[model samples]
Each structure stands twice: as C-alpha cells, then as structure tokens.
Target: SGGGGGILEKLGDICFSLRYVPTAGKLTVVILEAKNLKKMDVGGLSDPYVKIHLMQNGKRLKKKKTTIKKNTLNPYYNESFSFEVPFEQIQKVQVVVTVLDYDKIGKNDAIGKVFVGYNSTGAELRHWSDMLANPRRPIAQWHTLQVEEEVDAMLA
Candidate 1:
C-alpha cells in the first residue's frame, strides 16, 4: 500500500565500535552496549544478551556471545572480539548482531537485531571505510534493530 506499517518490532538499538589494522591483520568490533529494548516477558522486562556473528564465504565463520543482563531494558556490555582477516576478507564478512531475551529453561526469544559489514548496507560499508581511513581508531555508532528477514533481503 506504500503506507508505513510496522511488521518487525523495533526491539532496541546497539552501540558498537570497530577497528582494523592491516599490518596486524586483525579486524575487530567492540560491542560497547545495547539499550531501549522491547520488553519480552510478563515481568515487563527482559534478560537480554547480544550475539555476534561474522560471516565469510556465505558462511558463519566466527561467533561471540555476551553475558545476559538480568531484568533490564538497557544493558551495558563493553566487550571486544577480533579475527585474523585481510582487508579484502574483512569486506567480505558480514556482521550480524542478534539480541535475544535470555531464558534458562525455555527457548530464548529474539528481541531484535542489527547487521553491518559486507553484503549488508551502504552504511555498513561506509563505516568500514571510515575505520580504515582512521586506522586504530574506533568508529562508534548506534544501529537500530531490524528484522531477520529484512536483513536477509538486504544481504542478498
């Protein structure tokens, strides 16, 4: 209808930073924090956690997960991860962020997600360039949560 209708719920947003060094051959993204999450439980809160996926050659190469913060809408996770990748390889790897509501027994529910890096979006690439231009410096930004299907479309 060309009218705006919200399908995938906006779970929340995440702030992250990254850097790459050609000499060291390390590409890294520091998952700084996440905030303003959509409540997913009966208690009007969610135990949220962050999942990081690095994709290369159309496959998930590396995965990193964060600890779940209990009963909060906003959680601060200052964490970092690195991979041995060349500049070209870095451009070929897509970064996927999956925010999940933590559960001990039941299946964990996905709250929202934001993706960046290769096969993703223009902004993703631009940030990559920005990091390269300002090497050794962290380029931090807030990415709004998006749906998995829509993000998949963007990658394709």
Candidate 2:
C-alpha cells in the first residue's frame, strides 16, 4: 500500500570535543553543533536534540542531553557535560551520541548516531585516541553518523 523510491533515510553530522583530566579524574564532553540534519516535519524543518550516553565495556554509565531546537535543520547546542572517570579507565570508556527529531505527538525519530571509542575505526577511533594521549586539551572533530546497526557494531 505504501512505497516510494525508498524510505527517506536519516542523515546528519555532529561536532563535539573531548577533554580528559587525569589529575582531576574528570572527562568532559562538549557538543558544539550539528548540521545538515534530516527534515522531519511538513514544514521542512525538525526539532532537533542531542542525547549522549557515557558507557564503559558496553554498559552505560550515565546519560545526558541538550535542549531541543524548535525548528531547524542545523542546530548549535554548545553544551558541555562531565563524568567521573579515572585515568586508568579512560581508555575503556566510550560515548554514544544520537541526534533526534523531537516530537510531542509521537515518539522522537533519530536523525543520526555515532560513537567515540578506542575500538572504533576512522574518526571515532582517532578522536578517542587523541584525547587519551593529550590530557587537558580538548580535541574537537565533526563525526559522520552511521545507521543504527553500524553503531551497534561499534559497541561490540
């Protein structure tokens, strides 16, 4: 009953920075902005928000998020969050970032997803490694989001 050329796929990129302080045993994540997000509304705009999960060894340690932008394809969040992680456990920790289209009438739809970890590949891996190597200096990068399944592989 319903079929187009294909379903409108979700696409987007997120910019964030990571900082680790060994002496203080703190890890900070700064979500700078997101661009080229998927359009989810009839008006060709979406209410976007960022949800982050701090994880270790496949288990989530904490969850944090940014405020919703009313209606826009590009959003500048500029939010920062911190977690308590020891220097020894820094390499074992990872972060999962998801950009979602907020909806009041229904469940929010995910626009894109990405994770940063030592075991990940490409930018994800590079970003995590860089932060670990250089303490106190935040390393920022724009990461390409992957499908839900692809993110799952990063967890595994």
Candidate 3:
C-alpha cells in the first residue's frame, strides 16, 4: 500500500525515491540507507525543505511547510514526516510533496508533485470517543451511513 514510486536520482552518496500512497489519509516521505547516504557530507548539503499542500479541482485548500534534518542517524538513516487532513476537508484532499536543496541559492533544486483523490470522510469527521458514547448518542442522530457512503463513493 505504501511503497516507492521510483528512483528519483542520486544526490552525492544518497539515492532518493519518490514514494506515495493514495489510500492513506496521512502522507509520509522517508529517507533510507544507501551506499551514497553513508558517505554523504551532511554539513555541506543545505537543509531539505519539505512542503505539503491539499488541493481540490486544481486549487489549493491548505499548505504546510517543514525542513529535514541530516544529522538523524537512525541506524538506517531514516527520517519521516506526516500530516493529518481535517475531517471536513477530507473529500477535497489532495497531498503534494516537495523536497528542496536550499544550499545553492533561492529555491535550489526541488522535486515535487501532487497526490489526488485521497478521501476519508468517516474517519476525519468522526466524533471523539467520549462524544460518540455520550448519554444521548449524538453522532448516530447527526451522522448517517447513507451520507458517509455518498462521500466515500465520491472519494473512490
């Protein structure tokens, strides 16, 4: 379900892969061990910029930005980042991942694209357990299986 798309390219000692999962609500990009990665000079490379966007009908709904650290030596030299899609926005969810080498100049060499049609209304819009099990059972009255099925089908 979650695996590599293909080899991106070799950057110094590190071999990068563009990975994606359409079924997963959250998205994760991971850097793993390779021969080049082991010999890489972390200090010389600029911090990797990571940006995520949620898009609908070619327009962006939300955006998040972060940076990747090189010093992470987790045996496999692996690092991952993930983001949650708001329940209300799940139907319109589209995730984009951008990786940038910020060392050279403005923007530098960047790789990115978008993930489309990732829908999960039931999970995102579900009530908290405390609220779900409340004295009055508000969720059962407020949310219907038909409505969830309709949204789920749209996402599919």
Candidate 4:
C-alpha cells in the first residue's frame, strides 16, 4: 500500500483549490491525489464518474475523465490526476472538479464545486497597497491633497 494519508484526508470529500506559480516558459501543473476509492453498487446502483474541468470566464475550458488502476495490497486503490495550463493563459484560469455517481434508476448525485486561481503577477499585492494608502480617495486626491499638502507643510 502506497500511503501517506487517507484520500479523504489529503483530498477531502469536498473539492479544494490547488495554487501554482509558474517559472518563465513553464506550464503550471496541478495534481490531485485520491485514495482508497471504491466502486459501490448497492441494490443495482452504480458508482459515479469523476470528471475534472478547467474553466475560464464561466465556460468549460477543458475536461478530463478519471481512471482507476489496480493496487497491490488494497485490491481497490487510489491514483493521481494532473492538469496543466500554459503561462500565457494563467490570468483567465479557474478549475472545478465534479464527482457524479448514478443510481440504478439513472438518477445523478453531484459533488459541490471547487474554485481555483493563479497569482502569477503582483496584482494581489498592488490591490492591497491601494487599499491601505487610499482607502476612500481618488488618485488625484492622493497626489494633490495628501502628498502635495505634506510637501508644502515641510517647506513652510
């Protein structure tokens, strides 16, 4: 058994975010690990399908279907799925993973959505600075009233 933590512990029952920062000319990679996944068919009910989706601007950018491979000690097993996006497209990226298991009667049960984002640029930091330095004033007010007034007072 290749084990570090329970699949649920590593990747909770609910979906979660994976953050990545890319180097120049490199693709950003996101890896998902699942463990001890079982195929359940109760009273003729079938296990659900797992699908990963990449999104941008409220649209589906890409989708991947998950696969289950055999494990040695645990007859049923866990696996990893990886997704990558190029650096140029990082600004418009969001991701969602969904799990859907269908009952024998063809009813569907879906998991909650997960949200993800990339902060490759310093935009987040610049937003924080703007909030702190000028909470309610316009940029012109900052320059003329705040900065200019301070400089004039020192000269006087």
For residues 1-156, what per-residue lDDT tens digits would candidate 2 score against the true structure? 211111234487889999999999888999999888878898669999999998877788899999999988889999999988888887787889999899999998887788877566677778888988998999999887666665766676
Instruction: Rank the models by TM-score, top first.
Output: 2, 1, 4, 3
lDDT of 1 by residue, 1-156 (tens): 221111336668788887888778787888888888889899579999898887765577789998889998889989888878776676667778888998888989888776666655545556666777887788998777766666655555
Task: For candidate 1, give the lDDT of residue 126.
Answer: 64
At residue 10, candidate 1 shows an lDDT of 64
Worst 10 residues of 1 by lDDT: 1-10
Candidate 4 per-residue C-alpha lDDT over 32-126 given as tens digits, one digit per residue, 9 for 90 to 100 = 33323333344432254455666665567678655532321112213334456665775556544444444546555442223334321132223
Score residue 111 of candidate 3 by CA lDDT: 32
Among all candidates shown, the one with the greatest lDDT: 2
Alpha-carbon shift of residue 72 in model 3 (angstroms):
8.5
- Residue 44 error, candidate 3, Å: 4.4
Runs of candidate 4 with Cα error greater than 4 angstroms are 1-48, 68-77, 104-107, 118-156
Error of 1 at 7 (Å): 11
Clashing pairs in 4: 48-101
Best by TM-score: 2
The true-versus-predicted C-alpha distance at residue 17 of model 1, in Å, is 0.5
- Candidate 3 positional error at 3, Å: 10
Q: What is the TM-score of each candidate against the true structure?
A: 0.86, 0.88, 0.37, 0.42
Clashing residue pairs in candidate 2 are none
